[PDB]
Design a protein around this ligand. Structure first.
Ligand SMILES: OCc1ccc2c(c1)CCO2
Ligand SMILES: OCc1ccc2c(c1)CCO2
Ligand SMILES: [Cl-]
Ligand SMILES: [Cl-]
Length: 163
């Protein structure tokens, strides 16, 4: 575990992370995808061997010894707000199981269902709060990766609000 498990946020490409494993914002089919998923495919293409897994689940595939945790958030275009909320909570609970199983001391994690799967809504708070609910009981250092300058500020404020 980490010395003093922390949350941090960085505004940069998760494919450049400095952590012991990465969480992909995957699609259920293990396809290269777009956004975070395509960055992950370019950097760790070997990790897409038999990476297909259902919505609300996570499936780890090793790229060398580097673990890629393929987490499948719901596409809110297709799910109801209620069912999508359940599946998004579930995906992060499966990430926490994988992070624990792997024995890593740090993980790089994107905000699931906030991009193309957001159904055109701002889900920063929804996605981050489900991230915290899952990861709070883990002792890995968590580094959240985002693209937008205003999102960085809001995620940082949310982390600091808990102290
Ligand atoms: O698409 C690659 C990429 C990802 C995050 C990010 C940047 C680029 C600039 C600021 O943060
Ligand atoms: O612009 C697409 C994109 C790619 C990688 C990545 C992000 C976005 C946020 C953190 O990591
Ligand atoms: Cl997304
Ligand atoms: Cl972002």
């Amino acid at each position: 575990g980490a010395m003093a498990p922390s949350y941090r946020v960085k505004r940069m490409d998760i494919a450049k992370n400095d952590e012991e494993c990465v969480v992909n914002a995957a699609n259920p089919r293990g396809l290269p995808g777009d956004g975070v998923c395509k960055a992950v495919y370019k950097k760790w293409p070997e990790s897409f061997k038999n990476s297909a897994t259902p919505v609300g689940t996570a499936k780890t595939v090793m790229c060398g010894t580097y673990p890629v945790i393929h987490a499948v958030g719901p596409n809110f275009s297709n799910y109801t707000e209620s069912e999508g909320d359940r599946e998004l909570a579930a995906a992060y609970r499966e990430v926490a199981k994988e992070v624990t199983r792997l024995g890593v001391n740090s993980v790089a994690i994107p905000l699931l269902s906030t991009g193309v799967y957001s159904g055109g809504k701002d889900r920063l708070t929804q996605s981050l709060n489900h991230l915290f609910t899952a990861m709070d009981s883990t002792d890995a250092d968590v580094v959240i990766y985002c693209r937008d300058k205003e999102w960085e500020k809001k995620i940082s404020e949310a982390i600091q609000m808990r102290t």
